[PDB]
Amino acid sequence: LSTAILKQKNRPNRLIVDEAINEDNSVVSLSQPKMDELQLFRGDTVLLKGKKRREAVCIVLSDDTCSDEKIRMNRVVRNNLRVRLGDVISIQPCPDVKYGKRIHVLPIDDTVEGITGNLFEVYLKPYFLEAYRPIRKGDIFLVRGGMRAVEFKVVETDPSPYCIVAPDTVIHCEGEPIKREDEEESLNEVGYDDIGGCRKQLAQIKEMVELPLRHPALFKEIGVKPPRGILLYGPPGTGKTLIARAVANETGAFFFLINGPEIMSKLAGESESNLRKAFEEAEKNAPAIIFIDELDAIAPKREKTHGEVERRIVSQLLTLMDGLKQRAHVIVMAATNRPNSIDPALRRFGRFDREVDIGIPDATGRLEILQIHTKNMKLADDVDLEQVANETHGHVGADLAALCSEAALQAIRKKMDLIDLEDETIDAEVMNSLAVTMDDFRWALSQSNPSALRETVVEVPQVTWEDIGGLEDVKRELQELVQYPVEHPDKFLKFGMTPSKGVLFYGPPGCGKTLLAKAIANECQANFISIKGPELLTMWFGESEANVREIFDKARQAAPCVLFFDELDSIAKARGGNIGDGGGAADRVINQILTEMDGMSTKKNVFIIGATNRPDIIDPAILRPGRLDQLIYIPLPDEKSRVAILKANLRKSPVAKDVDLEFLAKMTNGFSGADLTEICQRACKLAIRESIESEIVPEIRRDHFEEAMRFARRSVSDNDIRKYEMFAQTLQQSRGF
Amino acid sequence: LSTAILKQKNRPNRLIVDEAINEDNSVVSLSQPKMDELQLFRGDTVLLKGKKRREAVCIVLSDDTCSDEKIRMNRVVRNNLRVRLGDVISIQPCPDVKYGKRIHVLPIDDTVEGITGNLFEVYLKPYFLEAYRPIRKGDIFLVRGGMRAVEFKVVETDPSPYCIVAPDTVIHCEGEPIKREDEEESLNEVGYDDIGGCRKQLAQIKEMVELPLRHPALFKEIGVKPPRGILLYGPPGTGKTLIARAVANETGAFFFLINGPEIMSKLAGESESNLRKAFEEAEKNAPAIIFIDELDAIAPKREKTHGEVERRIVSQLLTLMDGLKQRAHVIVMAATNRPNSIDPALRRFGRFDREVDIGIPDATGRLEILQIHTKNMKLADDVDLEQVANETHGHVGADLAALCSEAALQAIRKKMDLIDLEDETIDAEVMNSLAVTMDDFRWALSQSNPSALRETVVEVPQVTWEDIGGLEDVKRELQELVQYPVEHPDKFLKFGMTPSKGVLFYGPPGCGKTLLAKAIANECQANFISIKGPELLTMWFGESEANVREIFDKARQAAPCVLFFDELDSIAKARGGNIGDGGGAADRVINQILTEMDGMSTKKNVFIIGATNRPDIIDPAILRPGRLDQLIYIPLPDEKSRVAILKANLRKSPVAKDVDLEFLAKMTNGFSGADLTEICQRACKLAIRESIESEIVPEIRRDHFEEAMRFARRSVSDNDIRKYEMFAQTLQQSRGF
Ligand SMILES: Nc1ncnc2c1ncn2[C@@H]1O[C@H](COP(=O)(O)OP(=O)(O)OP(O)(O)=S)[C@@H](O)[C@H]1O
Ligand SMILES: Nc1ncnc2c1ncn2[C@@H]1O[C@H](COP(=O)(O)OP(=O)(O)OP(O)(O)=S)[C@@H](O)[C@H]1O
Ligand SMILES: Nc1ncnc2c1ncn2[C@@H]1O[C@H](COP(=O)(O)OP(=O)(O)OP(O)(O)=S)[C@@H](O)[C@H]1O
Ligand SMILES: Nc1ncnc2c1ncn2[C@@H]1O[C@H](COP(=O)(O)OP(=O)(O)OP(O)(O)=S)[C@@H](O)[C@H]1O
Ligand SMILES: [Mg+2]
Ligand SMILES: [Mg+2]
């Protein structure tokens, strides 16, 4: 529903074109039935719209040879104009055009490379028939009679509308030929097709940029106003500049790029004039887009600033931006990488009220980035872009660009022996043999290049319910207070409660308190944030009180979200617990968590799950009825529960049928899940030890498990079982005394 | 009494006009009896006063057709001039007017759109009779003979008083027609009708602005002086700029707007001249109002300032403002969002002595804001603005503006399939089908848009006495020391005491110590401030000693107020209690609270209520006779008291008559109110679990309660009951040893 605009379906008229047996690759595709709805008369040309204001004209009504009701595929229409299939193309007439009078010929590498002669009748006579060069400023045509070597372009634009070359004219031989850099630079512009892994973010940009300007009367009738402030923020390298460069070409509005350091490097008083002129320009025309790059580099905080000239820029910006009215139709956009170093006065009502966050993509996001980035390189058949995306975790779109370059350099390293450093030019018989293989990427994933920045990742865990053995009742209970209050909200206002948000896990260590938290988030298809114990202690190093609030602020925006706190024992261990040094374990970070938890609304979908293994040093203040009410105890697995753990831990291992899984169930009594995992990890090393010494077979036998039982140590003493059971029944009574 | 001016009643002469059956909608309303009190002779026009210096003239003495003693409702008087009914309109004669001589015709979209011809006798002949265009600069009339399409306005103003067009003149055809932006911009000005949820605040502004200037002789006879400094402060987004923009149009005095960043962005020495000229202008005329926006952005603290030019502005302002005398009649107004970042020298006697605080509105306040904001949008019949106001808690007038825009965007999202992005213009047969439905707001209340700033809210709690079960004596006792010393102050000076302010609650947890504090505040119709335990610990992060004093300062101004401290155990838990690490639990925040409490006057209405559940680690210093004297102990509910708790917790649930409420009273012995609430919350989930699985009935049966008794755990041990009773009798003896 939210992304229904981007969908392109529900049209039986159109279909996918298969491979045809026709060899007619020198004619356009024209069909008769489509000719009955247009009102085109017997004119000269047909006007159509493509993309990026780039079209192409050819001979009309000349095919009548190929199949019908099918667009003929050509080897020249796949590079320009059209790039794919599934785009709606509309045509409209445009009379009162102005024909051209005099257009000269400007060659590049066709006349100077060969023979010049008269440049009129040398090779143009066999083409000047039935068409007086129907050319246009922005079209690249093709004509030759020799060795297939010709490339002609035009740069002079005398008329504003479309023009047609008239016969009986002269040739202006006093012009400068165009070089290669100019045509190459304005041919490889980026667009919406070069952005991968970001679909929801780009949907919101269109609804605020390509709708108020194109259809200004839509919002006037309703009575609402479009936003005039859009702010982009995220980690450095996500691709913020790509969005700015892509929205500047797909839209037919004026774009004015504003640099951050360029304004900051001007003289005294010169910086203030360029800002005024930028807006005085944009207010002249109705369609205008203003983009500012690195806003924080030009308008920092006014309290940590020692220079008056630096504050003058902030004052000038605050003066110029709030002076905009409705009829100006000016949209101001900005992008930065430090949302916290901003000045508070900018992100207020009227200046920057709408914000777009660019998060770190998951494997699906980076797969598309790799596919679109490696579209022109020569790849082999053993490559696999899906496998690479699984091993990369902290890689943003900037890292994938360098990874491919490193892989290409490693691939071409091995061809060092037949070329030389002092050699003049490389021979062409080895130029075509370079191809990136699978082993190239494996070496690139083991150096300092993958060493990048990695932060708190908000995504959906891949842990399923099949990886957890036993605990039938816990899984049922977890689904009755997370899945129900989200999928069917109508079941709660009828009886008249509010759902209870908050569950605390307690029990002996090594029972699987993290897999339960991940599986419930995976089942409901919600976000998951994992904050560990020591991370909160080390985060607070320079006494900053703004490093925990934005965690809740980020979790609130990504609704539904599951906020989980892991290893809650280390925090209580900082002071000691109930008595500690003499006070309590209610330290600086406990109060912030309690205050942020108490302020959450009852209509939100942010669910909080707690887990700990020290039910004797917990803070009584957190057990209040309204922060963490639910108490779930996970006991040690019994004989029946341990059957599934071994089968779940051996899914990817070729276990032989002779191994009796039920025999090891009764052998182990005081062993938890971690002990069984250790037993599996130890017993399967014997097969590797034997297989590596046999080389001077690849399957785990029965004798491998019998050897590890004499070395399997117990991790849970008999005294701890007697102590956990006491707190398993009387835990809510700890408050007060 | 305080708001008696705003009341409009006590007048039997006027009444409400109902619907009439007359179809005469082309004539003015004139009545005979009202013609006997005025002294208007047989002149030409009648002068009357409306609002915003905008009037309207028409044909006088021509109706004599409609009913009598009733103002006829018209379809053209509801847009301009008059907007409602109940305003006193007075008339006065004004002789010695100057008639006009030459007024040309300036069309907008009536002459250029069609046929021009001579522009004199084309369509104006059938109107030039019995009236020589009685027009005025500020009136919009209506005349047509075609398709009802005409809009004529005038911009040239040669005479100062009212003028009448004289016959036998010429037409000045050398003028520039007026565009659409100019007429639209000065038509939608904001006023007092666009401010909702603020009635008491606007009452004080009038008594200081629209009274000393209009009636300067009132204060001279008494011998007092009107204030010359008004400061506005509050959270960002409350609508401070609206008040400034509204008071500038409803008053007939000169207004000069002063920006904050615009002055700060000037050159060296240029900023000081604009400030001098602003006052040198205002001193010329008697009625003058000076408003400064964002005072803190121009005059910060002089100790945290590194620039000399920035301090020069503060020195210049301090020099210019105190130089004003009585006869200048100049009122200086300012508005800021950070009252603490101010310079101390400005908020003194003579510069800024009077301050207006704009608090966060309650549900009633935001309902009016929503009603006035959604006055032009197309709403459906299933909408309900009252329900939306209940779910929004931390929403200021700025947030409601964006909420409606988001709802409108969501409503128009679903119409994506019949319009296209590349389409030229939208057809008119779907332009009228857009309407906001109920489901639009539900989606808007679940995204990042409602995520706004929320602070300490001062309002009246909605908790009544019917939601509390038992405790007959506690409710009676609470009414004898809060309700009595406020409603009937005369009962205390006769016998000769001072009332005792301060009550401390102590007892086992989960008995309802917060509902008692809220109900007494609700009954007496007073404010309520809830400050929790951890909030005081986390507030003090950067060692600021000005974060607790303004809490008492704010509570003092909103008299009567009830200041309540919740969870007073965590503060004592910071050090340990009586012994702790070796010292005491009298930490940094205890002394501030004690010092602020000792300094309160005995004539104030600020009542302080304390509540805790740790009567063994309390500070003996706080039990002094004069801070917290009253000691109230809340015991566990008995069999009789628990009868009402279940009935109070099941008011919104359809409980069947077969469920015996008296059967569960004797079954529970050591269960407090929280345990019963948990039992209710657990037993009613079984009905939902059954109703969700039956779909592959909506009423709680008897078997749902019998299942939860086997899982109901006790939260109060037998040892804690024996310990609370000891302190319930000997608590005041803890002081000294
Ligand atoms: N989604 C993407 N698809 C393909 N290439 C991408 C993508 N995102 C980033 N890149 C590439 O990575 C580069 C990173 O540049 P940007 O992230 O745009 O720089 P930035 O956002 O301004 O942040 P800086 O430069 O580190 S301060 C881009 O220029 C592209 O070459
Ligand atoms: N039922 C189970 N089936 C398979 N593996 C399990 C099961 N329960 C636990 N494990 C594994 O045992 C290990 C326990 O890791 P954790 O989740 O960290 O344990 P924990 O309960 O969170 O307590 P700690 O303090 O972290 S050891 C992981 O490797 C799990 O994959
Ligand atoms: N009572 C109200 N009724 C209707 N609309 C309101 C009301 N209060 C605020 N608004 C709207 O919300 C906007 C908020 O602007 P203001 O609060 O006036 O800005 P400000 O008070 O100067 O504080 P800033 O701009 O955040 S520093 C107004 O411009 C209105 O559009
Ligand atoms: N007499 C009662 N009738 C109905 N509900 C009650 C009654 N007494 C308490 N409750 C409920 O029980 C819960 C107790 O919450 P609190 O007011 O926080 O308890 P408290 O006495 O303040 O002590 P703590 O430390 O906060 S648990 C709330 O959900 C109340 O609505
Ligand atoms: Mg773990
Ligand atoms: Mg309470």
mmCIF file of C-alpha atoms in Angstrom, chain B residues 399-640:
data_model
loop_
_atom_site.group_PDB
_atom_site.id
_atom_site.type_symbol
_atom_site.label_atom_id
_atom_site.label_comp_id
_atom_site.label_asym_id
_atom_site.label_seq_id
_atom_site.Cartn_x
_atom_site.Cartn_y
_atom_site.Cartn_z
ATOM 1 C CA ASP B 399 2.762 18.822 15.954
ATOM 2 C CA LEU B 400 -0.961 18.993 15.129
ATOM 3 C CA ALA B 401 -0.127 20.979 11.982
ATOM 4 C CA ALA B 402 2.121 18.208 10.639
ATOM 5 C CA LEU B 403 -0.219 15.426 11.793
ATOM 6 C CA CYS B 404 -3.015 16.683 9.530
ATOM 7 C CA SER B 405 -0.628 16.965 6.571
ATOM 8 C CA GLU B 406 0.601 13.399 7.111
ATOM 9 C CA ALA B 407 -2.989 12.155 7.369
ATOM 10 C CA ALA B 408 -3.907 13.949 4.133
ATOM 11 C CA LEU B 409 -0.881 12.468 2.352
ATOM 12 C CA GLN B 410 -1.826 8.979 3.559
ATOM 13 C CA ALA B 411 -5.410 9.539 2.385
ATOM 14 C CA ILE B 412 -4.294 10.578 -1.114
ATOM 15 C CA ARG B 413 -1.703 7.789 -1.318
ATOM 16 C CA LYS B 414 -4.377 5.210 -2.199
ATOM 17 C CA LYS B 415 -5.475 7.151 -5.315
ATOM 18 C CA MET B 416 -2.176 6.377 -7.096
ATOM 19 C CA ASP B 417 -3.572 4.008 -9.724
ATOM 20 C CA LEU B 418 -5.747 6.286 -11.884
ATOM 21 C CA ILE B 419 -3.379 9.262 -12.037
ATOM 22 C CA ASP B 420 0.171 9.162 -13.392
ATOM 23 C CA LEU B 421 3.409 10.947 -12.557
ATOM 24 C CA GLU B 422 4.044 11.857 -16.212
ATOM 25 C CA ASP B 423 0.440 12.959 -16.800
ATOM 26 C CA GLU B 424 0.044 16.601 -17.820
ATOM 27 C CA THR B 425 -2.983 17.690 -15.763
ATOM 28 C CA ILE B 426 -5.362 15.904 -13.398
ATOM 29 C CA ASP B 427 -8.938 15.440 -14.576
ATOM 30 C CA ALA B 428 -11.666 17.247 -12.640
ATOM 31 C CA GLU B 429 -14.009 14.259 -12.223
ATOM 32 C CA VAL B 430 -11.685 12.789 -9.567
ATOM 33 C CA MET B 431 -10.620 16.097 -7.965
ATOM 34 C CA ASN B 432 -13.773 16.181 -5.803
ATOM 35 C CA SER B 433 -13.606 12.593 -4.485
ATOM 36 C CA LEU B 434 -10.759 13.094 -1.987
ATOM 37 C CA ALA B 435 -11.917 12.933 1.637
ATOM 38 C CA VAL B 436 -10.039 12.092 4.833
ATOM 39 C CA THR B 437 -11.476 9.038 6.592
ATOM 40 C CA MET B 438 -11.019 7.603 10.107
ATOM 41 C CA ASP B 439 -8.414 5.012 9.084
ATOM 42 C CA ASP B 440 -6.138 7.807 7.821
ATOM 43 C CA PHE B 441 -5.401 9.104 11.336
ATOM 44 C CA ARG B 442 -4.740 5.648 12.813
ATOM 45 C CA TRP B 443 -1.824 5.145 10.414
ATOM 46 C CA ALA B 444 -0.519 8.653 11.150
ATOM 47 C CA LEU B 445 -0.456 7.870 14.901
ATOM 48 C CA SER B 446 1.998 4.993 14.428
ATOM 49 C CA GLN B 447 5.035 6.521 12.653
ATOM 50 C CA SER B 448 8.007 8.769 13.477
ATOM 51 C CA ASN B 449 5.822 11.888 13.105
ATOM 52 C CA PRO B 450 4.171 11.664 16.576
ATOM 53 C CA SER B 451 7.680 11.257 18.022
ATOM 54 C CA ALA B 452 8.055 14.723 19.569
ATOM 55 C CA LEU B 453 9.470 16.344 22.716
ATOM 56 C CA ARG B 454 7.732 15.697 26.023
ATOM 57 C CA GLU B 455 8.565 17.402 29.327
ATOM 58 C CA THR B 456 7.043 17.604 32.811
ATOM 59 C CA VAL B 457 3.313 18.141 32.233
ATOM 60 C CA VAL B 458 1.340 20.255 34.719
ATOM 61 C CA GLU B 459 -2.375 19.459 34.473
ATOM 62 C CA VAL B 460 -5.312 18.002 36.418
ATOM 63 C CA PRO B 461 -5.332 14.184 36.731
ATOM 64 C CA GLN B 462 -8.376 12.258 35.531
ATOM 65 C CA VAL B 463 -8.318 9.714 38.385
ATOM 66 C CA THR B 464 -11.539 9.794 40.411
ATOM 67 C CA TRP B 465 -12.490 8.304 43.777
ATOM 68 C CA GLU B 466 -14.528 5.512 42.162
ATOM 69 C CA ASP B 467 -11.335 3.860 40.870
ATOM 70 C CA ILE B 468 -10.002 3.297 44.418
ATOM 71 C CA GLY B 469 -11.418 0.466 46.525
ATOM 72 C CA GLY B 470 -11.480 0.570 50.301
ATOM 73 C CA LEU B 471 -9.528 2.965 52.517
ATOM 74 C CA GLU B 472 -12.568 4.808 53.834
ATOM 75 C CA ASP B 473 -10.639 6.632 56.575
ATOM 76 C CA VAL B 474 -7.694 7.691 54.389
ATOM 77 C CA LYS B 475 -9.992 9.498 51.946
ATOM 78 C CA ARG B 476 -11.708 11.309 54.826
ATOM 79 C CA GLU B 477 -8.362 12.299 56.356
ATOM 80 C CA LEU B 478 -6.967 13.606 53.057
ATOM 81 C CA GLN B 479 -9.961 15.944 52.679
ATOM 82 C CA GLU B 480 -9.478 17.578 56.105
ATOM 83 C CA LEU B 481 -6.054 19.112 55.373
ATOM 84 C CA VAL B 482 -6.149 19.956 51.632
ATOM 85 C CA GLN B 483 -9.763 20.782 50.760
ATOM 86 C CA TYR B 484 -10.530 22.675 53.982
ATOM 87 C CA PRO B 485 -7.528 25.098 54.047
ATOM 88 C CA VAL B 486 -8.304 26.173 50.474
ATOM 89 C CA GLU B 487 -12.076 26.377 50.070
ATOM 90 C CA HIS B 488 -12.784 27.919 53.498
ATOM 91 C CA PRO B 489 -9.717 29.863 54.693
ATOM 92 C CA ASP B 490 -11.867 31.636 57.315
ATOM 93 C CA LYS B 491 -12.027 28.520 59.530
ATOM 94 C CA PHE B 492 -8.368 28.759 60.612
ATOM 95 C CA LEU B 493 -7.575 32.351 61.614
ATOM 96 C CA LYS B 494 -10.452 32.301 64.120
ATOM 97 C CA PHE B 495 -8.854 29.554 66.228
ATOM 98 C CA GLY B 496 -5.371 30.812 65.390
ATOM 99 C CA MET B 497 -3.226 28.112 63.772
ATOM 100 C CA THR B 498 -1.449 27.859 60.470
ATOM 101 C CA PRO B 499 -2.430 24.819 58.370
ATOM 102 C CA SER B 500 0.091 21.988 58.201
ATOM 103 C CA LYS B 501 1.377 21.294 54.682
ATOM 104 C CA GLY B 502 3.058 17.949 54.059
ATOM 105 C CA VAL B 503 2.056 14.277 54.236
ATOM 106 C CA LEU B 504 4.308 11.211 53.994
ATOM 107 C CA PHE B 505 2.941 7.840 52.890
ATOM 108 C CA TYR B 506 4.561 4.609 54.037
ATOM 109 C CA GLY B 507 3.601 0.956 53.829
ATOM 110 C CA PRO B 508 3.966 -2.259 51.848
ATOM 111 C CA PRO B 509 4.331 -1.890 48.071
ATOM 112 C CA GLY B 510 1.405 -2.347 45.728
ATOM 113 C CA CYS B 511 -1.308 -0.693 47.830
ATOM 114 C CA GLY B 512 -2.164 2.357 45.706
ATOM 115 C CA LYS B 513 -0.032 5.217 47.014
ATOM 116 C CA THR B 514 -0.183 7.069 43.669
ATOM 117 C CA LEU B 515 -3.942 6.878 43.090
ATOM 118 C CA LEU B 516 -4.516 8.499 46.494
ATOM 119 C CA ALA B 517 -2.199 11.372 45.538
ATOM 120 C CA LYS B 518 -3.936 11.842 42.177
ATOM 121 C CA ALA B 519 -7.530 11.605 43.463
ATOM 122 C CA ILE B 520 -7.135 14.356 46.073
ATOM 123 C CA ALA B 521 -5.664 16.668 43.426
ATOM 124 C CA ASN B 522 -8.538 15.812 41.073
ATOM 125 C CA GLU B 523 -11.203 16.489 43.720
ATOM 126 C CA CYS B 524 -9.886 19.939 44.668
ATOM 127 C CA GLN B 525 -9.356 20.950 40.998
ATOM 128 C CA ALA B 526 -5.687 21.824 41.399
ATOM 129 C CA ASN B 527 -2.494 21.192 39.461
ATOM 130 C CA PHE B 528 -0.389 18.060 39.910
ATOM 131 C CA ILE B 529 3.342 17.576 39.304
ATOM 132 C CA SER B 530 4.743 14.034 39.403
ATOM 133 C CA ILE B 531 8.507 13.805 39.981
ATOM 134 C CA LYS B 532 9.847 10.263 40.241
ATOM 135 C CA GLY B 533 12.930 8.906 41.984
ATOM 136 C CA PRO B 534 15.384 8.103 39.181
ATOM 137 C CA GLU B 535 14.438 11.320 37.351
ATOM 138 C CA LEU B 536 16.205 13.379 40.030
ATOM 139 C CA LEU B 537 19.327 11.213 39.762
ATOM 140 C CA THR B 538 19.522 11.448 35.964
ATOM 141 C CA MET B 539 18.603 15.157 35.866
ATOM 142 C CA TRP B 540 21.859 15.936 37.696
ATOM 143 C CA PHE B 541 24.295 14.758 35.047
ATOM 144 C CA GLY B 542 26.451 17.804 34.271
ATOM 145 C CA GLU B 543 26.439 19.217 37.817
ATOM 146 C CA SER B 544 23.742 21.878 37.355
ATOM 147 C CA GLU B 545 22.250 23.520 40.455
ATOM 148 C CA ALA B 546 19.471 25.305 38.526
ATOM 149 C CA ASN B 547 17.501 22.189 37.510
ATOM 150 C CA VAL B 548 15.614 21.740 40.800
ATOM 151 C CA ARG B 549 14.910 25.347 41.868
ATOM 152 C CA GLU B 550 12.732 26.163 38.861
ATOM 153 C CA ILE B 551 10.597 23.108 39.659
ATOM 154 C CA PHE B 552 9.515 24.794 42.899
ATOM 155 C CA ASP B 553 9.359 28.152 41.106
ATOM 156 C CA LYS B 554 6.960 26.669 38.528
ATOM 157 C CA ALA B 555 4.867 24.902 41.173
ATOM 158 C CA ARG B 556 4.530 28.153 43.144
ATOM 159 C CA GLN B 557 3.125 30.117 40.196
ATOM 160 C CA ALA B 558 0.414 27.539 39.406
ATOM 161 C CA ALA B 559 -1.353 27.895 42.753
ATOM 162 C CA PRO B 560 -3.120 25.881 43.920
ATOM 163 C CA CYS B 561 -0.739 23.022 43.099
ATOM 164 C CA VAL B 562 -0.016 19.572 44.523
ATOM 165 C CA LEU B 563 3.675 18.643 44.402
ATOM 166 C CA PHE B 564 4.190 14.882 44.691
ATOM 167 C CA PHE B 565 7.420 12.880 44.893
ATOM 168 C CA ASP B 566 7.170 9.264 43.738
ATOM 169 C CA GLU B 567 9.560 6.361 44.381
ATOM 170 C CA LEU B 568 11.491 7.967 47.229
ATOM 171 C CA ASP B 569 13.303 4.674 47.913
ATOM 172 C CA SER B 570 15.779 4.870 45.014
ATOM 173 C CA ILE B 571 17.253 8.128 46.342
ATOM 174 C CA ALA B 572 17.905 6.579 49.762
ATOM 175 C CA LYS B 573 19.254 3.484 47.981
ATOM 176 C CA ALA B 574 22.015 5.571 46.362
ATOM 177 C CA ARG B 575 24.018 5.695 49.614
ATOM 178 C CA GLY B 576 22.518 2.739 51.486
ATOM 179 C CA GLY B 577 20.390 4.300 54.201
ATOM 180 C CA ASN B 578 21.137 4.715 57.899
ATOM 181 C CA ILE B 579 24.715 3.375 57.643
ATOM 182 C CA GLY B 580 25.344 2.812 53.922
ATOM 183 C CA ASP B 581 29.041 2.863 53.094
ATOM 184 C CA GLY B 582 29.666 4.389 56.531
ATOM 185 C CA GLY B 583 27.982 7.773 56.303
ATOM 186 C CA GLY B 584 24.333 8.561 55.627
ATOM 187 C CA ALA B 585 21.733 8.810 52.875
ATOM 188 C CA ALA B 586 21.654 12.634 53.051
ATOM 189 C CA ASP B 587 23.136 13.228 49.610
ATOM 190 C CA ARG B 588 23.388 16.216 47.271
ATOM 191 C CA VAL B 589 19.708 16.180 46.254
ATOM 192 C CA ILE B 590 18.337 15.752 49.790
ATOM 193 C CA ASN B 591 19.790 19.064 50.978
ATOM 194 C CA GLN B 592 18.409 21.001 47.997
ATOM 195 C CA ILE B 593 14.915 19.611 48.613
ATOM 196 C CA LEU B 594 15.128 20.412 52.330
ATOM 197 C CA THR B 595 16.381 23.961 51.705
ATOM 198 C CA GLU B 596 13.677 24.668 49.122
ATOM 199 C CA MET B 597 10.983 23.188 51.384
ATOM 200 C CA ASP B 598 12.044 25.238 54.413
ATOM 201 C CA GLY B 599 11.771 28.516 52.479
ATOM 202 C CA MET B 600 8.088 28.282 51.535
ATOM 203 C CA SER B 601 5.580 30.742 52.972
ATOM 204 C CA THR B 602 2.672 29.757 55.211
ATOM 205 C CA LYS B 603 0.068 31.621 53.109
ATOM 206 C CA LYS B 604 0.669 29.611 49.924
ATOM 207 C CA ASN B 605 -1.510 26.811 48.543
ATOM 208 C CA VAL B 606 1.365 24.565 47.402
ATOM 209 C CA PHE B 607 0.801 21.217 49.131
ATOM 210 C CA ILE B 608 3.509 18.534 49.225
ATOM 211 C CA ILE B 609 2.753 14.801 49.377
ATOM 212 C CA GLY B 610 5.435 12.165 49.943
ATOM 213 C CA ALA B 611 5.253 8.415 49.406
ATOM 214 C CA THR B 612 7.749 5.624 50.067
ATOM 215 C CA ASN B 613 7.904 1.907 50.836
ATOM 216 C CA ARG B 614 11.177 1.811 52.844
ATOM 217 C CA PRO B 615 10.437 3.139 56.354
ATOM 218 C CA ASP B 616 13.801 1.858 57.654
ATOM 219 C CA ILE B 617 16.292 3.791 55.486
ATOM 220 C CA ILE B 618 14.534 7.173 55.533
ATOM 221 C CA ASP B 619 16.469 10.301 56.444
ATOM 222 C CA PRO B 620 15.700 11.407 60.033
ATOM 223 C CA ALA B 621 16.261 15.041 59.015
ATOM 224 C CA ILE B 622 13.122 15.004 56.834
ATOM 225 C CA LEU B 623 10.857 13.869 59.699
ATOM 226 C CA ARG B 624 11.247 17.227 61.452
ATOM 227 C CA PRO B 625 8.054 18.856 62.797
ATOM 228 C CA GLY B 626 7.531 21.361 59.996
ATOM 229 C CA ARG B 627 8.508 19.630 56.749
ATOM 230 C CA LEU B 628 6.570 16.315 56.795
ATOM 231 C CA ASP B 629 4.570 15.918 60.004
ATOM 232 C CA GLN B 630 1.659 13.731 58.904
ATOM 233 C CA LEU B 631 2.336 9.982 58.856
ATOM 234 C CA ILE B 632 -0.287 7.805 57.155
ATOM 235 C CA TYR B 633 0.067 4.017 57.024
ATOM 236 C CA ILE B 634 -1.774 2.014 54.355
ATOM 237 C CA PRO B 635 -2.211 -1.623 55.480
ATOM 238 C CA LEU B 636 -2.992 -4.598 53.279
ATOM 239 C CA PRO B 637 -6.652 -4.793 52.191
ATOM 240 C CA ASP B 638 -8.845 -7.199 54.138
ATOM 241 C CA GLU B 639 -11.694 -9.351 52.784
ATOM 242 C CA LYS B 640 -14.140 -6.427 52.733
#
